[PDB]
Amino acid sequence: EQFKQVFKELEFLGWYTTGGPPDPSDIHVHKQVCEIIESPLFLKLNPMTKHTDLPVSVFESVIDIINGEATMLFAELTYTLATEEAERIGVDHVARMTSTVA
Amino acid sequence: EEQVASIRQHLASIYEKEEDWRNAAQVLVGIPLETGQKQYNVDYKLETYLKIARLYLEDDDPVQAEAYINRASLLQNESTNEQLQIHYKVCYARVLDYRRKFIEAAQRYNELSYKTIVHESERLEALKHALHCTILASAGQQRSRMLATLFKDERCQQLAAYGILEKMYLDRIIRGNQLQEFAAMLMPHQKATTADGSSILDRAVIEHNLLSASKLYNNITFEELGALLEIPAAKAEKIASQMITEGRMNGFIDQIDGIVHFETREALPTWDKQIQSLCFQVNNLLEKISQTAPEWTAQAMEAQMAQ
């Protein structure tokens, strides 16, 4: 209710969290989130990583029937960084931290 | 009386067993609905109420049946062992389907398709009904969410209508033969045909094919837009003008030579997009190289960074 006042065209999409691989706690929380929105996205950020790539991972819930019960699993998605000149300039200025053609 | 009614019950059921639905009109008065003064068990009354629903469905009177089952839905919540819920859900989904409320029936059937109590064949049948009701539903984003949900399922790959759900969700062109097969496999009550025929499904498929052809073509002639949608050229021009007018497409019609123009993809933004795609390919190729040969990749990285 608060944020609908400021951003009118923006809508709920999913939730995010911090950790490693998806966990049963995450798949339990995803059910409560899915109770609000039919297809919520899941975002996981690893604050302590060891690779040389961005640790952000995006998942979507896929339900399945197996062994006589319904199990909900996570399918990974591929994301791309969005484009905006103001956002790019702000990000570059923040990253750098110190003639007009030089 | 209880025994007197029961004795005729099996006889009437056996007489109806001949698959005679014409007699289903008269069987309604043969059932002892209110003749007893005593209030029977809740389960018996609910079972009678539910069995009257499918009988009236064959009698083609759903308008009163909707409120009739709605008022019993309040008492249906309680005094259920296991199968009352399944029967009530199936009957409600069927009565919603028969009332041309396709989108709500699709959601109900999708929810029904996951209950584990019923058999696997029943689950597949519920999924098939949900898919058909979604496809027959009215255009909008609501139906789009259900289409995406069905597409994410895999149990839908073994249905006969998957080849049309895939093209409906992904914005492809549905040819004539696929639509003919889908219509042949449909039920008579689902095949609505407002006013002069104009079957609603046939108009929606045409309007979807025209919308999907706007992504493959830069500008298409009337004589070949009609041959792509399987309609006369005048009809193609009329439908294109109708969709362009209100809000449903982008483009304009030139009537002199005869051509409808979609978006034109200005040169410079296209150049920027192609630069983005080429750099994306470079990044993906580097990631693949780094992943399929880490030991050589580390040595290669530590040969120009420290150079």
UniProtKB/Swiss-Prot annotation, chain A:
What GO cellular component term, any one, is given? cytoplasm
Tell me the Gene Ontology biological-process terms attached to this UniProt entry: protein deneddylation; protein neddylation; regulation of protein neddylation
Instruction: Say yes or no: keyword Cytoplasm present.
Output: yes
The alphabetical list of record keywords is: Cytoplasm, Host-virus interaction, Nucleus, Signalosome
Principal subcellular localisation of the protein: nucleus
Q: Does the keyword Lipoprotein apply?
A: no
Q: Where does this one sit in the cell?
A: Nucleus; Cytoplasm; Cytoplasm, Perinuclear region
Organs and tissues of expression: Widely expressed.
| UniProt signal peptide | none
Q: State the family named in the UniProt similarity comment for this chain.
A: Belongs to the peptidase M67A family. CSN6 subfamily.
Q: Quaternary arrangement and interactors, per the entry?
A: Component of the CSN complex, composed of COPS1/GPS1, COPS2, COPS3, COPS4, COPS5, COPS6, COPS7 (COPS7A or COPS7B), COPS8 and COPS9 isoform 1. In the complex, it probably interacts directly with COPS2, COPS4, COPS5, COPS7 (COPS7A or COPS7B) and COPS9 isoform 1. Interacts with the translation initiation factor EIF3S6. Interacts weakly with RBX1. Directly interacts with COP1 and 14-3-3 protein sigma/SFN. Interacts with ERCC6. (Microbial infection) Interacts with the HIV-1 protein Vpr.
Q: What does this protein do?
A: Component of the COP9 signalosome complex (CSN), a complex involved in various cellular and developmental processes. The CSN complex is an essential regulator of the ubiquitin (Ubl) conjugation pathway by mediating the deneddylation of the cullin subunits of SCF-type E3 ligase complexes, leading to decrease the Ubl ligase activity of SCF-type complexes such as SCF, CSA or DDB2. The complex is also involved in phosphorylation of p53/TP53, c-jun/JUN, IkappaBalpha/NFKBIA, ITPK1 and IRF8, possibly via its association with CK2 and PKD kinases.
User: What is the protein name stated in its UniProt record?
Assistant: COP9 signalosome complex subunit 6
Q: Which organism is it from?
A: Homo sapiens
The coding gene here is COPS6
Q: Which residues of the full protein are shown?
A: 110 to 218 of 327
Swiss-Prot record, chain B:
Domain PCI span(s) in chain numbering: 98-267
Subcellular location per the Swiss-Prot or TrEMBL entry: Cytoplasm; Nucleus; Cytoplasmic vesicle, Secretory vesicle, Synaptic vesicle
What are the annotated GO cellular component locations?
cell junction; COP9 signalosome; cytoplasm; cytosol; nuclear speck; nucleoplasm; nucleus; synaptic vesicle
Q: What biological-process GO terms show up in the record?
A: protein deneddylation; protein neddylation; regulation of protein neddylation
A molecular function annotated in GO for this UniProt entry is: deNEDDylase activity
According to its UniProt record, which protein family does this protein belong to? Belongs to the CSN4 family.
How does it associate, per the subunit comment?
A: Component of the CSN complex, composed of COPS1/GPS1, COPS2, COPS3, COPS4, COPS5, COPS6, COPS7 (COPS7A or COPS7B), COPS8 and COPS9 isoform 1. In the complex, it probably interacts directly with COPS1, COPS2, COPS3, COPS5, COPS6, COPS7 (COPS7A or COPS7B) and COPS8. Interacts with TOR1A; the interaction is direct and associates TOR1A and SNAPIN with the CSN complex. Interacts with STON2; controls STON2 neddylation levels. Interacts with ERCC6.
Tell me what this protein is called.
COP9 signalosome complex subunit 4
Species this protein is from: Homo sapiens
